[PDB]
Amino acid sequence: SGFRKMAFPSGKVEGCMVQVTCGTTTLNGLWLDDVVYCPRHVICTSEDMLNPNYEDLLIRKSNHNFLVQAGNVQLRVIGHSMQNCVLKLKVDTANPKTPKYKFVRIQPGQTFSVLACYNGSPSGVYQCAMRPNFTIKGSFLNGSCGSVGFNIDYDCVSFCYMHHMELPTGVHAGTDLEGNFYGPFVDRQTAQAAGTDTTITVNVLAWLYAAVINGDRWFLNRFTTTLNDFNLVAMKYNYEPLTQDHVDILGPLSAQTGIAVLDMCASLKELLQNGMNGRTILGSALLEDEFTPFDVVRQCSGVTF
Amino acid sequence: SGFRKMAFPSGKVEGCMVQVTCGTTTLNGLWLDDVVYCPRHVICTSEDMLNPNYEDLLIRKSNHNFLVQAGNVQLRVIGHSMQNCVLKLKVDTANPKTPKYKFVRIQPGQTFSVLACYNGSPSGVYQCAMRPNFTIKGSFLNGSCGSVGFNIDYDCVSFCYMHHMELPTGVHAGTDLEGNFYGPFVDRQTAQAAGTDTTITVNVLAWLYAAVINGDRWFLNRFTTTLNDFNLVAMKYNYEPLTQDHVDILGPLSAQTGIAVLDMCASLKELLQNGMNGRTILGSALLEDEFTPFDVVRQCSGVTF
Ligand SMILES: *[C@@](O)(C(=O)NCc1ccccn1)[C@@H](Cc1ccccc1)NC(=O)[C@H]1CCC(=O)N1Cc1ccccc1
Numbered sequence: 001s002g003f004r005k006m007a008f009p010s011g012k013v014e015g016c017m018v019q020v021t022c023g024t025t026t027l028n029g030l031w032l033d034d035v036v037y038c039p040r041h042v043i044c045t046s047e048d049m050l051n052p053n054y055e056d057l058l059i060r061k062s063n064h065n066f067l068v069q070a071g072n073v074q075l076r077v078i079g080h081s082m083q084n085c086v087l088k089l090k091v092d093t094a095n096p097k098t099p100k101y102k103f104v105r106i107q108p109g110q111t112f113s114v115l116a117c118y119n120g121s122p123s124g125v126y127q128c129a130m131r132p133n134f135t136i137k138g139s140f141l142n143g144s145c146g147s148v149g150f151n152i153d154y155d156c157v158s159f160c161y162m163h164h165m166e167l168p169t170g171v172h173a174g175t176d177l178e179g180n181f182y183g184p185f186v187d188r189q190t191a192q193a194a195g196t197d198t199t200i201t202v203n204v205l206a207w208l209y210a211a212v213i214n215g216d217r218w219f220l221n222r223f224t225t226t227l228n229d230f231n232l233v234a235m236k237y238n239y240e241p242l243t244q245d246h247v248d249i250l251g252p253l254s255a256q257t258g259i260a261v262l263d264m265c266a267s268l269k270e271l272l273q274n275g276m277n278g279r280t281i282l283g284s285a286l287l288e289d290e291f292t293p294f295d296v297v298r299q300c301s302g303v304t305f
Numbered sequence: 306s307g308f309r310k311m312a313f314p315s316g317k318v319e320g321c322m323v324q325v326t327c328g329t330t331t332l333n334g335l336w337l338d339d340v341v342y343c344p345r346h347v348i349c350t351s352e353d354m355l356n357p358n359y360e361d362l363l364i365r366k367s368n369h370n371f372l373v374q375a376g377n378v379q380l381r382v383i384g385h386s387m388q389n390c391v392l393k394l395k396v397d398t399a400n401p402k403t404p405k406y407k408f409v410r411i412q413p414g415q416t417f418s419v420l421a422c423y424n425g426s427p428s429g430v431y432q433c434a435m436r437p438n439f440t441i442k443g444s445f446l447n448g449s450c451g452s453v454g455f456n457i458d459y460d461c462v463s464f465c466y467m468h469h470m471e472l473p474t475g476v477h478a479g480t481d482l483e484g485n486f487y488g489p490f491v492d493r494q495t496a497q498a499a500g501t502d503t504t505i506t507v508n509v510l511a512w513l514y515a516a517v518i519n520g521d522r523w524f525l526n527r528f529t530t531t532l533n534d535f536n537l538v539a540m541k542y543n544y545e546p547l548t549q550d551h552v553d554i555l556g557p558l559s560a561q562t563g564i565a566v567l568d569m570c571a572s573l574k575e576l577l578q579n580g581m582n583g584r585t586i587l588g589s590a591l592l593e594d595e596f597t598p599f600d601v602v603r604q605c606s607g608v609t610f
Pocket residue numbers: 024025026027041045046140141142143144145163164165166306
């Protein structure tokens with residue numbers, strides 16, 4: 001029993017973190033096989049970040065201008081290339097701790113673990129989600145750039161996020177490991193505003209199933225609804241529309257609890273309209289949207305890695 | 306910016322987890338140097354757990370009755386002993402991944418990371434606190450016994466918790482690594498009721514400082530108070546009394562924000578009396594009490610390991 005915001009065990013990723021320095025700029029890199037991946041703005045001064053031309057700045061850089069340190073030992077850089085907003089530094093040594101891995105680009109609503117790092121050293125691990133506006137609500141300080149987000153399937157690490165930027169509103173922007181930003185964000189110190197941070201409806205429903213599995217049941221109501229009716233309410237409350245694809249993904253939790261997905265939608269509709277009335281669900285006074293249906297099944301079934 | 310329920314990186318602990326089997330009972334063990342630590346009820350059947358005599362059950366056990374498996378390889382057991390509610394299995398191989406470590410017994414209100422494990426394999430990592438009633442609000446399923454809780458100081462893992470029991474109310478009980486239960490709990494399948502789960506006041510104050518550091522300031526009020534006045538309110542709302550020792554521990558956060566500890570107490574007093582009025586602080590609709598003052602300083606300063 002119990003339900004926690006649970007991260008993946010971080011060991012396989014801890015073994016990949018390095019420090020990358022170019023001139024006076026130091027940040028984190030990810031060392032997999034004989035390549036180190038890091039944000040391309042390692043080549044920028046704070047001044048350069050106001051309006052950088054990355055191709056032009058890279059002409060002034062050679063392999064020996066990139067200092068890579070792994071557990072206080074220097075790696076030899078034998079090539080470098082820019083792919084979108086990341087740099088790939090070829091080193092002469094394969095990381096002996098390289099896990100089985102993939103690079104994936106995740107969809108809004110998908111959760112992942114972050115290993116927040118500074119100077120190539122881990123600070124902490126926490127669970128995030130890709131918000132519908134393609135920001136993440138991380139916990140990051142100066143020097144966190146190059147920290148990564150990931151999921152694990154048994155022994156395989158799927159890297160989905162590298163941290164680049166903090167927006168003026170204190171939310172976070174970054175790339176996949178191919179260097180493509182999530183959302184419209186750019187690696188420039190220019191005012192960049194986020195869109196509406198809508199609530200991830202399928203995740204809220206997953207968490208209400210988690211609540212029922214854990215015996216928190218006060219919010220279960222006498223009503224059902226339809227997708228179209230529910231979605232009129234979702235739109236009013238800045239919830240993402242629910243699709244039949246979302247209903248399909250919730251099938252296993254519906255089967256485990258015997259609560260039809262549209263019945264749970266009707267219970268959520270009443271919570272949105274009535275509020276909590278000072279009550280809690282799984283120790284929260286608000287509806288939690290950073291557990292996916294797969295996260296709930298994983299945590300409620302004790303899947304290991 | 307941002308503030309997350311952040312766990313310690315789990316790699317150093319992942320390298321210590323093993324599976325222990327005695328007859329038909331399998332659970333998790335912690336392998337440090339040439340000793341494996343596990344709950345003593347590994348020797349019990351489900352039937353035995355209703356009223357076990359551990360000394361009597363242990364007479365029927367030899368070294369070869371304890372099966373220890375580390376990453377799918379068997380360890381040879383060359384001695385065993387019971388210390389309070391844990392077993393210590395001496396093995397013929399020192400764990401090559403043994404980190405620098407200490408065993409500590411924590412106080413109510415102190416936080417730690419849990420590496421939830423099943424069959425000696427990590428499932429996930431999350432942040433907990435020792436509640437004032439000496440329970441923890443974990444996330445644990447059947448087979449989680451022997452999972453551990455820990456803190457890290459740079460390179461040194463301080464183990465503070467081993468998971469044993471789930472109480473009928475779905476909260477968790479366990480021991481330090483010397484096998485002494487936190488609180489009055491026993492390793493027997495008997496109804497055991499927890500005391501009042503009071504709110505950890507010094508931790509709430511720490512988190513309000515975190516909120517101010519992050520620019521969440523709406524709750525800052527025009528008032529101050531005294532320890533005695535504040536504590537009359539704390540008692541009414543099932544908050545732990547605040548001591549001058551707590552005021553002293555909050556000094557660094559007071560200094561960073563320029564908000565006197567008793568001024569922050571007065572702001573908390575008004576929140577308890579007025580409620581949130583549907584507002585949030587650091588994305589929570591309730592006052593969070595599982596960040597210590599040290600946790601807030603660590604997360605807000607980017608301390609690494
Ligand atoms: C890196 O881009 C970074 O950490 N970004 C993510 C981030 C930043 C703040 C909050 C949350 N997330 C990083 C690279 C860098 C640049 C120059 C020197 C060293 C490293 N950039 C920074 O840390 C930025 C961000 C804001 C800022 O003032 N700053 C420069 C800086 C660096 C070191 C000390 C103070 C200020």
